[PDB]
Write a protein that binds this ligand. Sequence first.
Ligand code: MG
Ligand code: MG
Ligand code: MG
Ligand code: MG
Ligand code: MG
Ligand code: MG
Ligand code: MG
Ligand code: MG
Ligand code: MG
Ligand code: MG
Ligand code: MG
Ligand code: MG
Ligand code: MG
Ligand code: MG
Ligand code: MG
Ligand code: MG
Ligand code: MG
Ligand code: MG
Ligand code: MG
Ligand code: MG
Ligand code: MG
Ligand code: MG
Ligand code: MG
Ligand code: MG
Ligand code: MG
Ligand code: MG
Ligand code: MG
Ligand code: MG
Ligand code: MG
Ligand code: MG
Ligand code: MG
Ligand code: MG
Ligand code: MG
Ligand code: MG
Ligand code: MG
Ligand code: MG
Ligand code: MG
Ligand code: MG
Ligand code: MG
Ligand code: MG
Ligand code: MG
Ligand code: MG
Ligand code: MG
Ligand code: MG
Ligand code: MG
Ligand code: MG
Ligand code: MG
Ligand code: MG
Ligand code: MG
Ligand code: MG
Ligand code: MG
Ligand code: MG
Ligand code: MG
Ligand code: MG
Ligand code: MG
Ligand code: MG
Lengths: 134, 122
Amino acid sequence: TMTDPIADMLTRLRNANQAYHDQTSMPHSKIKAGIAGILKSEGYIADYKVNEPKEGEVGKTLTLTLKYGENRERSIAGVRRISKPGLRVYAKSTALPKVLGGLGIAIISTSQGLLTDKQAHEKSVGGEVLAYVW
Amino acid sequence: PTIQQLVRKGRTDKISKNKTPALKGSPQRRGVCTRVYTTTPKKPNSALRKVARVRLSSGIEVTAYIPGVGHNLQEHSMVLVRGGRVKDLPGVRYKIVRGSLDTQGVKGRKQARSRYGAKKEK
RNA sequence: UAUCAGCUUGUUGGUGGGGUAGUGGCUUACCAAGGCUUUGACGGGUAGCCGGCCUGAGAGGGUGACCGGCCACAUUGGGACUGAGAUACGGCCCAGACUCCUACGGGAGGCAGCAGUGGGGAAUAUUGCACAAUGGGCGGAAGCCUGAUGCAGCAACGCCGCGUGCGGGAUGACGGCCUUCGGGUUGUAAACCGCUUUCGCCUGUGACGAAGCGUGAGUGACGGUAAUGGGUAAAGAAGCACCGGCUAACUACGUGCCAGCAGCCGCGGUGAUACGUAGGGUGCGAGCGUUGUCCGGAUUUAUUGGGCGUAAAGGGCUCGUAGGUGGUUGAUCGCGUCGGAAGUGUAAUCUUGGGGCUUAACCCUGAGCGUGCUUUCGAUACGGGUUGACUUGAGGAAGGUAGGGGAGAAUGGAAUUCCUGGUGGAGCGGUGGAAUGCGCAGAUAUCAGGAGGAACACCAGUGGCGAAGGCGGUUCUCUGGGCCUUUCCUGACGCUGAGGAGCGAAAGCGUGGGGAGCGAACAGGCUUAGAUACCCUGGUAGUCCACGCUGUAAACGGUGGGUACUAGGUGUGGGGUCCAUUCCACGGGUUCCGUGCCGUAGCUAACGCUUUAAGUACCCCGCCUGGGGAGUACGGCCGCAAGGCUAAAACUCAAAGGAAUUACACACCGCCCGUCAAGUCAUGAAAGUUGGUAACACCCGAAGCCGGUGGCCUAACCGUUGUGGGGGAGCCGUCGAAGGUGGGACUGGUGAUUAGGACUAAGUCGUAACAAGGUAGCCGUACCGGAAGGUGCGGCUGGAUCA
RNA sequence: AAAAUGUUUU
Ligand SMILES: [Mg+2]
Ligand SMILES: [Mg+2]
Ligand SMILES: [Mg+2]
Ligand SMILES: [Mg+2]
Ligand SMILES: [Mg+2]
Ligand SMILES: [Mg+2]
Ligand SMILES: [Mg+2]
Ligand SMILES: [Mg+2]
Ligand SMILES: [Mg+2]
Ligand SMILES: [Mg+2]
Ligand SMILES: [Mg+2]
Ligand SMILES: [Mg+2]
Ligand SMILES: [Mg+2]
Ligand SMILES: [Mg+2]
Ligand SMILES: [Mg+2]
Ligand SMILES: [Mg+2]
Ligand SMILES: [Mg+2]
Ligand SMILES: [Mg+2]
Ligand SMILES: [Mg+2]
Ligand SMILES: [Mg+2]
Ligand SMILES: [Mg+2]
Ligand SMILES: [Mg+2]
Ligand SMILES: [Mg+2]
Ligand SMILES: [Mg+2]
Ligand SMILES: [Mg+2]
Ligand SMILES: [Mg+2]
Ligand SMILES: [Mg+2]
Ligand SMILES: [Mg+2]
Ligand SMILES: [Mg+2]
Ligand SMILES: [Mg+2]
Ligand SMILES: [Mg+2]
Ligand SMILES: [Mg+2]
Ligand SMILES: [Mg+2]
Ligand SMILES: [Mg+2]
Ligand SMILES: [Mg+2]
Ligand SMILES: [Mg+2]
Ligand SMILES: [Mg+2]
Ligand SMILES: [Mg+2]
Ligand SMILES: [Mg+2]
Ligand SMILES: [Mg+2]
Ligand SMILES: [Mg+2]
Ligand SMILES: [Mg+2]
Ligand SMILES: [Mg+2]
Ligand SMILES: [Mg+2]
Ligand SMILES: [Mg+2]
Ligand SMILES: [Mg+2]
Ligand SMILES: [Mg+2]
Ligand SMILES: [Mg+2]
Ligand SMILES: [Mg+2]
Ligand SMILES: [Mg+2]
Ligand SMILES: [Mg+2]
Ligand SMILES: [Mg+2]
Ligand SMILES: [Mg+2]
Ligand SMILES: [Mg+2]
Ligand SMILES: [Mg+2]
Ligand SMILES: [Mg+2]
């Protein structure tokens, strides 16, 4: 059964980006919506939208529309899940990870909401290292 | 393996085989020559490699090679035995230190003298 | 460490007393029956722990020398005494083992303090000086004591620094070595010229450490030391390893698979850059090598940071316990998590900033580090706890529905064999060819009738079902699971699952039954050098049934389960639903679940996989760590047995292996298997034999503390001044080291004999495998055989013919 | 239709 819906989101995004799909969809959760929002604010996806259920009439659907540049070029070089259900990863304000030498962003869930490493370091707050999207 | 599998049963290293058990944690050991003889090398190769069955002071008896052209040690000759394998000789894992105790340096050495216990000549 | 699974009876708790500095089964009496343990108790092995040290990018790995902190111990075992304080090192008591003295009655002793001796060992120092400094003990103090300490001796043991010369010098001298006899090289090297004097040697000066100590006088062990002036002579001062590749550096001579070298690859068989020497060179240098050990390289135990289709690796399959893990969301807690504050993390080390030794090593000093922990105050995104919702995961209801799913019972037909009868007569049968065999005592053949056992042609595969193993005549009875559906219900109830349990082809085993055909073993015939085989004729277990046992397979998709996502194309099985003509169905769609083939992205060493993943991801389980030895030995468990399960080590090799290219590549005159014979090495079994360790149950029981008793002995106290109180010797009791006795547990050596393993003649016997290896190979099992192997039964393709 | 084998050079 489903164990890590965040990892499911990440793998859905990775597979869709690899297959050059314009949009991907998944069941909605608050943390998924937050990660999608910070992905959009960091420019890794074109946009995102939460849709009220009208096909299954059961639950909200989170849909990410991706962006490909000139000559069909990926805007996401990769995404990786860090804090797995089997083994969870927490980083302090001083030991915050760097992704792609600082080019990519680690997504960290801090006590002040979802914050990209750069943000956390500015606020000197750590938390659970969710992802390494770059 | 999963993280839970590693937690339940961790990694275990290899055994790290020992090479010279008879020395018993010593760089070299004293022994007495219980037998002095020659052995044919394994194939390929062919000679009359000079070896000795030695009763080392650890109580273990092993076969030691005698390096260098020249040889004086015989029955009940006290020798110093160091590590060192002779590849084309099955069962020989030790060598006899020339120039120490009864065994003496190779006579006509002029190069690599220290490895054969040959004093410098004026 | 599970090849140690049960441990404990003052043991766990309670109440009263006692005891102690103090809590306490610490002790005692009584009461209760607890306590610990597969998250590993108990037992075995090893070990002082740490600050640190080495290594490493880090994470880690190894380690516990000096120095510093804690602990333990002081000849072995036990005991108390004194004291503020005791494992009481240089105390006492008892016992044991030792050494010494003795007049034989009895006494004395403990270097793991410093130095030193013997011994063991590959290996580690002087029977030194001083209390001048710092620290300690006693004294009011002067002071005394201090093998702490400060120093010196010894050792290249480590680290650091310095020297053995510097400039000039072509005529590129001789001499070695090489040569193409031209020369090249050693080589600016030398000769020769001019310089400098660190260290060493000779000689002079000469400290700091002492702002100490002492009333003063006086007072430095180190010590004529460091430092420093003068003098001498370029002098007193360079070795070791290496030069085939990795790896910096090559030639000649000698040797001739010899002598020898080697870390691996390998070198040496007459042109050796690999042996030995020489010249030349290279790396280092008061060192240089070798050996040992550790880390690295090794991502070669992969948390960082690996894998399991074929390379080593998915459990035979499922159920399920602990455990791990968890769809959406409200509220709340603030355990994880995160952020401050305080405390702590001694010093030294370490990193770093300053400073001192002529520099450095080293030393001092400031800071950091001390990766944590405790306390406290905050944050609430996530994990978790508590609590409430939601239905999409999951399960259920109702309806629809496919099927060799299973078990039981009855029963159908063909065919084989046998029996009876009719007919008929010379062969039949069998093969590459034959023969054994059967048959005029009428076989084979042919017809009729009957008996019996086993398997179910066609349907039938490109298919269905089952968790797997597997499942096919028909009928009935009993029963399991799957699939679909719009409504319906419950509301995360899910997933996986160590250990455990069950199921588990065939062979095999036990009891009974049955026995047609088939058919291990067996007998005979053929083939053959032989034929314990292939082939032929016979033929017993078995194959079958009932009930058990065994529990293994190439139990394979060589691919664990669950989930989500990521082109298609095209067959086929099952359930719906839609459409037109019907008002069937043919047809098309569409949806859900199977089952194949092709194929994109992607992945893979390649082959190949590719929505039924071997792709992208998350959760849980099993498993791998070079090839042999070996899935073997020992032990234990299971079994009636066969055996299965768990599962090593010594030793040995430098490969073993995967896929592919053109099991062989020395290229089929290839490769390669196993007995037997010989030698060598390691190991197992074994009547036994020889030790060791850890305890147990009893008997006896020293010292000693405690508890009694004390008629004997008693200066302080009190006396009615005849004594009493209190104490002490002695004595008894509990505990108690050692010893004795006995029966077990564990374990080492050894063992006639015996077993297999590894390696070596270039030995003997066959040819089992690799090609269709000449009978396709292999897996499990069974029996047989000199040996490979042969055969039966079931299975696999890691075989193929023919499509 | 069965039809075996191929020491040690340097
Ligand atoms: Mg009490
Ligand atoms: Mg010890
Ligand atoms: Mg340690
Ligand atoms: Mg110490
Ligand atoms: Mg006292
Ligand atoms: Mg004392
Ligand atoms: Mg003391
Ligand atoms: Mg003493
Ligand atoms: Mg001493
Ligand atoms: Mg000695
Ligand atoms: Mg003093
Ligand atoms: Mg004084
Ligand atoms: Mg004294
Ligand atoms: Mg080179
Ligand atoms: Mg030569
Ligand atoms: Mg490593
Ligand atoms: Mg290594
Ligand atoms: Mg690997
Ligand atoms: Mg896997
Ligand atoms: Mg394999
Ligand atoms: Mg399987
Ligand atoms: Mg099993
Ligand atoms: Mg559970
Ligand atoms: Mg959750
Ligand atoms: Mg909430
Ligand atoms: Mg410091
Ligand atoms: Mg300085
Ligand atoms: Mg410190
Ligand atoms: Mg919760
Ligand atoms: Mg139904
Ligand atoms: Mg039955
Ligand atoms: Mg058929
Ligand atoms: Mg098929
Ligand atoms: Mg409801
Ligand atoms: Mg079982
Ligand atoms: Mg059977
Ligand atoms: Mg039977
Ligand atoms: Mg029977
Ligand atoms: Mg036969
Ligand atoms: Mg099968
Ligand atoms: Mg397997
Ligand atoms: Mg499983
Ligand atoms: Mg899977
Ligand atoms: Mg399909
Ligand atoms: Mg793979
Ligand atoms: Mg076995
Ligand atoms: Mg034995
Ligand atoms: Mg007693
Ligand atoms: Mg008493
Ligand atoms: Mg009295
Ligand atoms: Mg007594
Ligand atoms: Mg005793
Ligand atoms: Mg024997
Ligand atoms: Mg053959
Ligand atoms: Mg064959
Ligand atoms: Mg046979």
